[PDB]
Write a protein that binds this ligand. Structure first.
Ligand SMILES: COC(=O)[C@@H]1Cc2cccc(c2)CNC(=O)C[C@H](NC(=O)[C@@H](NC(=O)CC(C)C)C(C)C)C(=O)N[C@@H](CC(C)C)P(=O)(O)O1
Ligand SMILES: *[C@H]1O[C@H](CO)[C@@H](O)[C@H](O)[C@@H]1O
Ligand SMILES: *[C@H]1O[C@H](CO)[C@@H](O)[C@H](O)[C@@H]1O
Length: 323
């Protein structure tokens, strides 16, 4: 059976996490994203000026076209990309997917034209939300899962340190105590789960649903919860140059926790200081608004506190404090 360890590394301020992937023999640095289901890459089909600062996929060398097939994706921050489709060999942590659909970019939006830290995305959401047309394709994980020892992957994201994506096995040294599992609702293609209650510092409230999403930097909550949290943070104010609530960098921030099937997942206040906010001398908060969408986004701020098991059997998510 197959298993492997893929090493991730945060960019500055842990904005995103990058992991190397070898496609047709070329290694690209990709953003592993449990919130989407497309494996797309910078390619030789982009204008030459947009290739600069990247490693790029050359489909002509090793790929097999899917004639007539295309892809086009849009993300929550308004970024987007599109192109055509080839199958090729894709290796992650020593585990090879043969005949994996690789979505070669022809068009990329401004955000991607400005980010030279990644060479594309590797989606790890359910394959039902893959965007390839006219027929959807499987994620790397779904392609390999029946070859793995167990049909799961697990994630340790860290603050300013390398972390892991474990494929096909659980590393019990990555967490304290035992895992607690909760049921996943895959009806919208996400790793969605329920929380029974939350604690924002000195205030608590009722539960809600949200998605485990490695591709979102922050912990995005309802505006009522965000307001409750920052009401406890002296001097907090919104700054649209920075991206939301900011505060003095020396602030002692309250913890934030959720109740997940009887387990308390706690984000220490230290992790809620995202980093310097950008002009001047404040720090951006790691908790921000979810734009009124009606569910929460358990992004990297939250995930840095946990080891998280994404198990296709169920499906289900397992949580324990990171170690
Ligand atoms: C339709 O599904 C998506 O777009 C999914 C899931 C989702 C759903 C609802 C709301 C969000 C996220 C909530 N998330 C968002 O609205 C924004 C999110 N982008 C970010 O976090 C961006 N982060 C920053 O700009 C740093 C700032 C916030 C200090 C991005 C550069 C990593 C984002 O769109 N992430 C997608 C990947 C990214 C590389 C573009 P993801 O695939 O994780 O988003
Ligand atoms: C992941 O698990 C497989 C299956 O036991 C091993 O072969 C591999 O070395 C890694 O520990
Ligand atoms: C990624 O790299 C880290 C070491 O940098 C390993 O521990 C891991 O197994 C993988 O090679």
């Amino acid at each position: 059976a197959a298993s492997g360890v893929a090493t991730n590394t945060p960019t500055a301020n842990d904005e995103e996490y990058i992991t190397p992937v070898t496609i047709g023999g070329t290694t690209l640095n990709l953003n592993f994203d449990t919130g989407s289901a497309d494996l797309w890459v910078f390619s030789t089909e982009l204008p030459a000026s947009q290739q600069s600062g990247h490693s790029v996929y050359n489909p002509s060398a090793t790929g097999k076209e899917l004639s007539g097939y295309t892809w086009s994706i849009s993300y929550g921050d308004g970024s987007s990309a599109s192109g055509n489709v080839f199958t090729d060999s894709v290796t992650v942590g020593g585990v090879t997917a043969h005949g994996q659909a690789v979505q070669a970019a022809q068009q990329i939006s401004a955000q991607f034209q400005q980010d030279t830290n990644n060479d594309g995305l590797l989606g790890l959401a359910f394959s039902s939300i893959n965007t390839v047309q006219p027929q959807s394709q499987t994620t790397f994980f779904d392609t390999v899962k029946s070859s793995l020892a167990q049909p799961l992957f697990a994630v340790a994201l860290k603050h300013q340190q390398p972390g892991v994506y474990d494929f096909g096995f659980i590393d019990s040294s990555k967490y304290t105590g035992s895992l607690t599992y909760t049921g996943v609702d895959n009806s919208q293609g996400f790793w969605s789960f329920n929380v029974d209650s939350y604690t924002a510092g000195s205030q608590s409230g009722d539960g809600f649903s949200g998605i485990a999403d490695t591709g979102t930097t922050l912990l995005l909550l309802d505006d009522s919860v965000v307001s409750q949290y920052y009401s406890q943070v002296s001097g907090a104010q919104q700054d649209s140059n920075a991206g939301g609530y900011v505060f003095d960098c020396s602030t002692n921030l309250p913890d934030f926790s959720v109740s997940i099937s009887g387990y308390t997942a706690t984000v220490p206040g230290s992790l809620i200081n995202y980093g310097p906010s950008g002009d001047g001398s404040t720090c951006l908060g790691g908790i921000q608004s979810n734009s009124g969408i009606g569910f929460s986004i358990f992004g990297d701020i939250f995930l840095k506190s946990q080891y998280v098991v994404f198990d296709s059997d169920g499906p289900q998510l397992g949580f324990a404090p990171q170690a």
